[PDB]
């Protein structure tokens, strides 16, 4: 997680799409103030986002479902 | 005083530094003997011969 | 370069011919340059400056 990022690349595949998924999640915790899934243990957003991907909690499909699940709650509610 | 790397020598081929070291030590060896006789407060004739 | 005269030759200006073309050059302390040079047909030329 801090030294290694191979265990994180194992899960997604593309070294590039890993940084994009990890950044988007890092930004949700950095701005939205979302909760970390893994014990944070005094690590910055950088590391925590990798930990969730490394263990397998964060994915391209996972985050897109969860986005529109918060946004569809808003749709039904407004009108 | 200083600890230098011996590997900065073969590749470099500047053996003059090692000779500088050896002679410097010899030179100091002589100063160390003269230092000892001057501390011991010996004699003018003893220093003269050496 | 010391003033006076100097003989040189581009050992093959045209490696086409590969001919060692010999040239001379008068180098003054002040003044214009005076060069003499051959050519593929060994015609003597002069090129001031």
């Amino acid at each position: 997680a801090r030294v290694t990022v191979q265990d994180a690349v194992e899960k997604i595949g593309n070294r590039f799409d890993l940084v994009l998924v990890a950044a988007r999640r890092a930004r949700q915790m950095q701005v939205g103030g979302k909760d970390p899934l893994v014990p944070e243990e005094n690590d910055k957003t950088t590391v925590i986002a990798l930990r969730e991907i490394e263990e397998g909690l964060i994915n391209n499909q996972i985050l897109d479902v969860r986005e529109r699940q918060e946004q569809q709650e808003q749709e039904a509610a407004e009108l | 005083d200083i600890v230098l790397n011996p590997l900065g020598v073969p590749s470099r081929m500047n053996i003059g530094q090692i000779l500088e070291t050896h002679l410097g030590m010899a030179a100091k060896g002589i100063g160390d003997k003269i230092n000892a006789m001057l501390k011991q407060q010996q004699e003018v004739a003893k220093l003269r011969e050496f | 370069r010391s003033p006076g005269v100097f003989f040189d030759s581009d050992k093959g200006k045209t490696h086409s011919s590969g001919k060692v073309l010999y040239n001379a050059r008068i180098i003054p302390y002040r003044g214009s340059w005076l060069d003499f040079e051959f050519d593929p047909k060994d015609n003597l030329f002069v090129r001031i400056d």
Partner: protein
């Protein structure tokens, strides 16, 4: 410069690529401590104002 007792041998890689390992005793004698006289100036100018 200054002469000193030197010893040629590696030391836990603190003399890796020609890197130097100097005693605190050299620093205590302040023998390789250097002097640097720096000159700074203050200019009183005549501006448009």
């Amino acid at each position: 410069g200054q002469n000193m007792r030197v010893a040629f041998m590696p030391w836990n890689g603190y003399n890796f690529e020609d890197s130097i390992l100097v005693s605190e005793r050299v620093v205590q004698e302040d023998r390789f401590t250097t002097i640097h006289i720096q000159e700074l100036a203050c200019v009183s100018r005549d501006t448009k104002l």
